[PDB]
């Protein structure tokens, strides 16, 4: 069963963004189905998939907290943060581009959860 890995990619992977601005967030959050209701915070990892999967092995990860894993490499990321009063669309997002390691949970060598706490 690789459905959670697939869902992880949908929610948290975007290989090649250009401008990672507010409009980038507002578009990709719609495109990936994260706007009913508006997700309060969501981060996308850029670059290749193989580096992300590698966090699940010694190659690019260490154990972290309770059964999570933290990457050794740094990733280009973009965090989309909801603003405005309402939980419901249209969903306005503020983009914050960043470059650091990421925390995930892995199952059968595949990432299945991104820990959003490090981007808050």
Residue numbers in the entry: 2 to 121
Paper text:
Angiogenin (ANG), a 14-kDa basic protein is an angiogenic ribonuclease and member of the bovine pancreatic ribonuclease (RNase A) family (also known as RNase 5). Like RNase A, ANG cleaves preferentially on the 3′ side of pyrimidines and follows a transphosphorylation/hydrolysis mechanism. In addition, the crystal structure of human ANG has revealed that it has an RNase A fold and the catalytic triad (residues H13, K40 and H114) is conserved. The enzymatic activity of ANG is several orders of magnitude lower than that of RNase A towards conventional RNase substrates, but essential for its angiogenic effect.
ANG residues 60–68 are part of an external region that includes strand B2 and loops on either side. Based on known experimental data to date this region has been predicted to form part of the cell receptor binding site44. K60 forms part of this region at one end of the segment and is located on the surface of the molecule in the 3D structure. Mutation of the residue to Glu retains ~80% of the enzymatic activity. Previously it has been shown that chemical modification of K60 retained 34% activity and this surface residue has minor catalytic role. In the K60E PD variant structure the mutated residue gains a new interaction with E58, which seems to result in a level of repulsion of neighbouring residues in comparison to the wild-type ANG structure.
